[PDB]
Every structure is written in C-alpha cells, then in structure tokens.
C-alpha cells in the first residue's frame, strides 16, 4: 500500500527476516523499506505487475491468496480422482491428437486470452483512471459510457476515440481519456511502459486468431483436416525428400519422448523471446527505473 | 586382524572388558543409565562456557539447556537405530564365543527389547548427568576453572 | 556470455557513461578490469573487520557460490576407483575399533557410481555457477541502484 | 540399592514406541515454548532494532 504512493522511492518488500543467529548490528542493517524489523527487498518485480493489473490494497491480495490456495486444493483432488477405476481415461482418450489440438488451440490459448482482455477493460484500465471496480459493483460500471452497442452495430471506431492524454498520472483521473481499445504503440510517458490500451487490444486480437485456428482438425463432425493425411500428402515429387513425411504421424503419436522434445524446443525459444522483449518494451508500470529488477 | 600391544594386553583387555558396553552379564537398563551418566555430565562444560551466552549471567542455565537437548536428540538417534536394526522377536546378534572358546550367552543388549531398555537407561541417565553438573558447578563451585 | 553482455551494456547506460563500454569492450582486459574487478568493489565489503552492511548477505552468498563450484571439480576430476579403495580401509577401521564395532551399517558403504559422480559433480558446478553470478548481479546493481 | 532405585525410575522411558512419540512431540513443544517465551535481552532478533533506519542510495528506493 505504501509502495503505490511513490513507486520510485520505496523499496518493494519481499518478506520478513527472523533468524535467531543475527547479532545486533545486522538487525539494524537489514531494517529498511520503512519496516519495523529486518526484511528482504523484493527483486522479482511482482509489485509493479500487480500495480498494473489493477490490484490496489492489501485486501485484494488476501483474497488473491485464498483463491489460488483453493485452486491448488482443487488440483490435488483431480490428481487423486483420476486414478480410481471409473475415472481413469483409456488409451484412446490420450492418443486423440485431433480433439486435443482443437481445445488447446481454441479453448486453452484462445478463450483465456479473450477473457484476459475482459479483465483488462473491466478492472485494469478503470483502475488506471481512478475507478475502483471490484466484484461488489462491477455490474454498475460501464467500460465505455456507450458500452456494448457500438460493437454490435459495426462502428467499432468509437472504442479508440479519446485515449489517455500525454500528461497522465498513472493512478488518477488527470488526462484520463475514455478509449478502451487503441493503437498507440509508444510508451506511457510517466511510467515508461507500454500503454494499457494497446495491451488490451493485442490480447483481443490474438484472442481471435487462436479461436479461428482452433477449428482445423476433425474430431466428430465430419469437417476439418486429418493430421495423418496432411503428413502423407506432402511428399515432394523428384524424391529429394524420399517418402517425405509419411508415417511420421504414428511415430510422433506413439513416442512420448518425441512429444516432450518438441514441447521443450518450442518452450525453450519463447522463454528467450520473453527475456528479449521484456527488457526493451517494459510491460509493467515503473519497472524500467527499478534497475535491479 | 593382528595382535599388537594396543589390541591385546592385560591393561587394555581389563579396561575395555569392564565398562558398561562390554559387561555382557548385567541388565541392559543399568548399562544404559551408567552410559547416560558419564556422557551427560561430560558435555555440560563446552555448551555453558563456549556457547553464545557465555558472557551473560545465564551461561549456567543456557549450557544446561543445550546439553539437555543434545541428550534428547541422541536418544532419538538411539531409538531409530534400535527400531530399524532389530525385530521384536529375533534373537541376539552378538558373538557368543570368547577368545578362549567358551560359548557364553549372547548379549541381551543386541536385542530389540534390550536396546529399547538401553535407551531408557541412556535418556534417564543423560538428563540426570547433565543436571548433576549444573548443581555442582553453581552451588559447590569454588575450586573450578570456570 | 549473454547475461554478461546485457548487464555491462546496461550498467554503463544507466550511469550515462556509455563511452566506457564502447571502448573497453574490444579487449579482454577491458572486460576483466572494467566490469568484473571494478563493479565488485561494493559487494566484497559486505562485511569487514570494520563493520557490516545490507550487502553482507550477498557477500556471503558470493563466496558460498565459489565454494560449491570448487567442490564440483572434486567429483569431475577424481574418478571412482580411487575412492572405492579408500572406503575399504575405512570400513576395516570401523570394524575393529572397540565401542564402535557395536554399531553396524545396515546397507554396506560404497563409493558413488561413475554416472552418479558426473551428475553430482555437475550439480555442484551449476549451483555454484548460478549463485555466484546471481549474487554479483544483484549486489553490484543494487549497491548503486543505477 | 542403586539397581532398584534406577530400575523403577527409568521404566516409563523404555518402551521404544512411546519414547519416540514423547521425545518429538514433547521436545517440539519445548522448542516452541522456549523461543516464544525467551527474553528479548538474550536474542537480538526477539528485540527490535529500536534505532533509526539508514536510507538507501538514490533517495530511499
């Protein structure tokens, strides 16, 4: 709560120190950040990320703790549940490579990105304009004073009308525009981060690509490609690639160590991609001046 | 092995053969309480005199608390061994043959029931030994170098 | 070589001293003098015979990084057959010491396997290599916060 | 005489199942009790600093 009041002069605090080997001059030394005893300064940059995405007090965090704690409890149930008989999937269920790629592409990657757009324009963006929206009242407030219309008509050209002014203070209403989806591309002048209204648009844009990319493969309804067929069909004439991709369907779809290899390779790249983009295009407010973070 | 002076001699073979661990013909409860007496009264020194409170007037009562715990931990480390190295109804694993060749009784200590008796001897002796140091060293406390 | 490059280029930028990288970064002694040696002045003073600072914990971890890393070599260089002959002598000494032949290993002691040593040796090398750099990265930057 | 005096006064601590429970549970309670009720003048952490805080570089951040 204090760090919010001045992000550039209050060391974020990670936790408290209680080590009964500490002597007295250490107890003094590690007391900082405006605490009462020794503490550790948080360098994981959580403080800025939760500022941006709309959290504002301690109390939001406590329910944030409980909810995730509940989600953890739910998962532990599932790991037990799917070992008993009459709840364990058969082989053919796991080896269904088509029906899985539809859901993962359209449901997992897809809807989640659409819903995160929902949170950005129902809580986050309103937070950065002085509006405190929570589960108590989020039915009264309108994301855009004419909301839910302009989209139905077809003149979506209103949600980018009047964006945040150049002279904006991140936590209050000065210069606060009313646009929710924009395309500005610059930096927020005060906080040296990407604009909120761009990031809402981008998660909305790629919320569509995956949804439409999700209906490719055939599951039960007689339309859509067969991944076995696509591999066979791509056999170059002239023989330079031999029999081409014939038979790679079974070899992948029967070797776990193959599937894991591909997953790691793709995951290995984008993590480097994440590292390269974050430091150039700071996506969280007041994180380009916390040099250590 | 080899018979050197150290491994065999009247003085050596009388010293070892008459301390509780080797008096194979007495009850393992007492063999536990002697052992805990000598060890317990032993280590009260370094905790009290070299601990982190030696300067403070609680050096007497901070060493004793330290030694008391260490006896308790070894009591656990004793019980873990007894419960994992013997079975409740299996006989003794001690050698039953003396050097002369007389086949003597197997030691009761090397037995689940015996060892559980022995640790009862060690623990009670360990705390009793470590208080007896504290009483002497801070009541009858003149001559010592403390 | 990647994180080194990112840190030094930025640590000169944040101070507004961008000339220092652009000249020293063409010869190796520039990297050793102007980045390693120079920027670790505040870290190593985490605790000295004059006093301590907030940076002491990072100074301690810094050496702790050097220690695990240097233990890594022990498992990579010295291979198994030497240690196995060393255990056998030890497992003889324990079997002949009086008062200590009363305690018997349940699982016989052997030196680590050939693959295990490589894995263990690499575990130390990696852990020591992360902790060392992670301490220098945080302390040096946070020392100046710029 | 020492045999009989010792033999009866160490019997409760002998059954290895019970000795293991009381050692950990009782001990774990005692460790809890000693630290939660130690004097602040023998544990530096248990007392606060009670001294002014030194600001960090670049203001307080």
């Amino acid at each position: 709560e204090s760090w919010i009041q001045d992000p550039l002069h209050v060391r974020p605090i990670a936790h408290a120190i209680w080590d009964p080997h500490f002597g007295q001059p250490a107890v003094e030394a590690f007391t900082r950040g405006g605490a009462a005893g020794p503490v550790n300064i948080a360098y994981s940059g959580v403080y800025q990320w939760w500022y941006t995405i709309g959290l504002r007090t301690n109390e939001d965090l406590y329910t944030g703790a409980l909810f995730l704690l509940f989600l953890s409890t739910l998962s532990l149930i599932a790991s037990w549940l799917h070992l008993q008989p009459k709840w364990k999937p058969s082989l053919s269920w796991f080896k269904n490579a088509e029906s899985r790629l539809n859901h993962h592409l359209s449901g997992l990657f897809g809807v989640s990105s659409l819903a995160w757009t929902g949170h950005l324009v129902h809580v986050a963006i309103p937070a950065s304009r002085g509006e405190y929206v929570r589960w108590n009242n989020f039915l009264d407030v309108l994301p855009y004073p004419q909301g839910l219309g302009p989209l139905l008509t077809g003149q979506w050209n209103l949600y980018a009308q009047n964006p945040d002014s150049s002279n904006h203070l991140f936590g209050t209403a000065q210069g606060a525009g009313t646009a929710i989806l924009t395309l500005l591309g610059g930096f927020h002048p005060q906080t040296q981060s990407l604009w909120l209204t761009d990031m809402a648009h981008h998660h909305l844009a790629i919320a569509f690509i995956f949804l439409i990319a999700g209906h490719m493969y055939r599951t039960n309804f007689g339309i859509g490609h067969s991944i076995k067929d696509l591999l066979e069909a791509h056999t170059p004439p002239g023989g330079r690639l031999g029999r081409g991709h014939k038979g790679l369907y079974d070899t992948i779809n029967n070797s776990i160590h193959f599937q894991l290899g591909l997953a790691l390779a793709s995951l290995g790249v984008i993590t480097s991609l994440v590292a390269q983009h974050m430091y150039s295009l700071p996506p969280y407010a007041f994180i380009a001046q916390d040099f250590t973070t | 092995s080899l018979e050197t002076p150290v491994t065999s001699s009247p003085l050596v073979a009388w010293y070892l053969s008459n301390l509780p661990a080797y008096r194979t013909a007495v009850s393992p409860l007492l063999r536990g309480i002697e052992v805990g007496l000598a060890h317990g009264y032993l280590l009260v020194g370094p905790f009290a005199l070299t601990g982190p409170l030696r300067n403070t007037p609680v050096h007497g009562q901070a060493g004793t608390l330290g030694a008391i715990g260490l006896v308790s931990i070894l009591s656990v480390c004793l019980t873990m061994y007894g419960v994992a190295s013997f079975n409740e109804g299996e006989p003794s694993t001690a050698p039953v043959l003396t050097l002369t060749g007389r086949k003597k009784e197997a030691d009761k200590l090397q037995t689940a029931e015996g060892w559980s008796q022995f640790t009862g001897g060690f623990f009670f002796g360990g705390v009793s030994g470590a208080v007896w140091a504290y009483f002497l060293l801070y009541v009858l406390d003149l001559p010592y170098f403390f | 070589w990647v994180t080194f490059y990112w840190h030094w280029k930025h640590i000169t930028l944040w101070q507004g001293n961008v000339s220092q990288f652009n000249e020293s970064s063409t010869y190796l002694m520039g990297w050793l003098r102007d980045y390693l040696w120079l920027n670790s002045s505040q870290l190593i003073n985490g605790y000295n015979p004059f006093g301590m600072n907030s940076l002491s914990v990072w100074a301690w971890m810094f050496l702790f990084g050097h220690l695990v890393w240097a233990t890594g070599f022990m498992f990579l260089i010295s291979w198994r057959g030497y240690w196995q002959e060393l255990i056998e002598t030890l497992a003889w000494a324990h079997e002949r010491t009086p008062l200590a032949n009363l305690i018997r290993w349940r699982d016989k002691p052997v030196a680590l396997s050939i693959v295990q040593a490589r894995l263990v040796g690499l575990a130390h090398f990696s852990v020591g290599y992360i902790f060392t750099y992670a301490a220098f990265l945080i302390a040096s930057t946070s020392g100046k916060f710029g | 005489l020492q045999s009989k005096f010792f033999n009866t006064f160490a019997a409760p601590f002998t059954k290895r199942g019970l000795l293991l429970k009381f050692l950990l549970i009782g001990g774990g309670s005692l460790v809890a009790y000693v630290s939660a009720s130690a004097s602040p003048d023998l544990l530096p952490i248990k007392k606060g600093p009670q001294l002014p805080p030194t600001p960090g570089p670049r203001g307080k951040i």
Binding site: W18 | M80, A84 | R106, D107 | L20, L24, G28, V31, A32
Partner: peptide
C-alpha cells in the same frame, strides 16, 4: 510473534520428524 514459533517448527521439528520417518521407511524389509 508468529514467526518465532513457525520458523523453529519448519526449521527444527519438521525436519527431524521427516528424516526419522524416511529412515524407517527406507530401511524397512518385508
């Protein structure tokens, strides 16, 4: 207050019971 109890429990007791619990399980025989 609360740290002074929970730090020892996870630092001293919870390790001890853990090590002694595994040691029996590892060294069992059936």
């Amino acid at each position: 207050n609360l740290p002074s109890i929970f730090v020892p429990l996870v630092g001293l007791v919870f390790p001890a019971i853990a090590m002694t619990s595994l040691f029996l399980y590892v060294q069992k025989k059936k």
